[model samples]
Target: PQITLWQRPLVTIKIGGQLKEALLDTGADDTVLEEMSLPGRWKPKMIGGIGGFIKVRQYDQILIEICGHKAIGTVLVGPTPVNIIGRNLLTQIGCTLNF
Candidate 1:
């Protein structure tokens, strides 16, 4: 799909039987989700974000569907500024910055 840069490449995602909107963040390395409570024990880790580094829980093997495109990947649950589908899951959907 040829997406114009006029707006952020945002998409709706399905996870935990719920829908949430997220950004197609090519600049990020991993996926990060906020304000959602997930089951299972997650590890504590700090990752970089805007302004400063963020502390987030590492939830592994999270299953999420991006606009009907299903894929499994890690989801960093924390108080990040936004929800993002980074390279980890973007490759699964075969998204490229093609003009």
Candidate 2:
């Protein structure tokens, strides 16, 4: 889908059999999700963005359905301001920003 900068880039996503709303955040380097229980082994990780740094759980090779496009990649679980679908998973869905 073609998205414009004039509006918030929010989209529907599915993870762990649950539907969620996430932001199509091109400015972010990694995907971040709200704290939720997912079946997997995770590692304690620290990630920082423009807001600040925070400790989050890192899960690798997690399958996610982004805007109905299925992709597998790393997902971070934390208390992010909102769910972020960043470059890591964005690239897999062939999302490109244009002026």
Candidate 3:
């Protein structure tokens, strides 16, 4: 499946039994969500971005639904301004850049 990146590609997704809008960021390698409570133990990790780096809780094998497509992958939770669905999960749903 292909999605246009004309603007900030925002899509509705289900995570941790909650529905939220997240930015589809091709530039990002992993999905990052705003501070939230998630089950299971997470390892502390630092992620680098355009605005330097921030500490995040890395959770593995999380179930997420995007556009009716369901996939299990890693999710990072932290003090992010917005939720981001990155290439890790995007590739599972056969999403690619369509220039």
Stretches of candidate 3 above 4 Å error? Answer: 49-51
Residue 25 error, candidate 3, Å: 1.2
Candidate lDDT values, in order: 0.84, 0.89, 0.86
Arrange candidates by lDDT, descending: 2, 3, 1
Regions of model 1 farther than 4 Å from truth:
none
Per-residue lDDT for 13-49 in model 2, tens only?
9989999999998788989898889899899999876
Best by TM-score: 2
| Top-lDDT candidate index | 2
TM accuracy, model 3: 0.88
Worst lDDT run of 10 residues, candidate 3, spans: 1-10
| Residue 23 C-alpha lDDT in model 2 | 93
Better of 2 and 3 by lDDT: 2
**1-99 in candidate 3: lDDT tens per residue?**
456666777889898789889987778888999787998789898986688787889998889888789998999999888999889988898887765
| Residue ranges of candidate 2 with Cα displaced over 4 Å | 48-51
